[PDB]
């Protein structure tokens, strides 16, 4: 779920900058869900 979304964010036609923000936001849910 996380890896499938992170890898999809990666191939998007957006800036690197935005790729990282969305990446950070996604694994923010994964970390809070597991904490």
């Amino acid at each position, epitope marked *: 779920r996380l*890896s499938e979304l*992170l*890898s999809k964010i990666n*191939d998007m*036609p957006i800036t*690197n900058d935005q*790729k990282k923000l969305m990446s950070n936001d996604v694994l923010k849910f994964a970390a809070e869900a597991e904490k």
Partner: antibody
Amino acid sequence: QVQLQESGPGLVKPSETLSLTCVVSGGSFSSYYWTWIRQSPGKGLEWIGEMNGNSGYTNYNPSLQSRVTISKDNQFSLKLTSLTAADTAVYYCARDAIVMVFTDMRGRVDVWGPGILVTVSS
Amino acid sequence: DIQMSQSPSSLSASVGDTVTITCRASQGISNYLAWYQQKPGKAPKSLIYYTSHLESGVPSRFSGSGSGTDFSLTISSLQPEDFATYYCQQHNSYPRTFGQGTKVEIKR
């Protein structure tokens, strides 16, 4: 180490299709984004596009979007159609960053092929 | 398309000189600037890839700095193998775009 090598005809006619193939050595094709880049004396280095080495998902240069295809055949190819003299250039395949996750190496190339001179002329 | 402008285009230097090459981007690029080296008849070689990050094997005399829109490739104590063309490349946005190159030539 990983090595790339271009192959294909280096003489193409104006309206007909440019076809090039890049085979990957080292054995890590499905982990990286793979690219095509071309260099012209008039327009310099141009990023043609990228391809997700696992899925085949692509992102093209808008200036090339409507007539460019990058695809899996450790081998991937570039097809450019409806050519003109302005497509005359040395074409390189190259390795971008990993597909799995964003890394900061995203969008730059680390390894290049030797390059292929494609001549567009009648 | 983000336009990339290198200054100077040509440059005369000697062995042991410190040389710097400017690369300007038309917009911000979140400091995603790469540098490449190219010698005649050869494919370019990757030098630096996130303003400052040296590619493996690259001599430490090559250093990258800069921010916002202005970036610098600095070669400290130039060597005979460094005489070549250097290109910058933004790798933040699509499409990826390159400068016109800066040719480092031998002064005599």
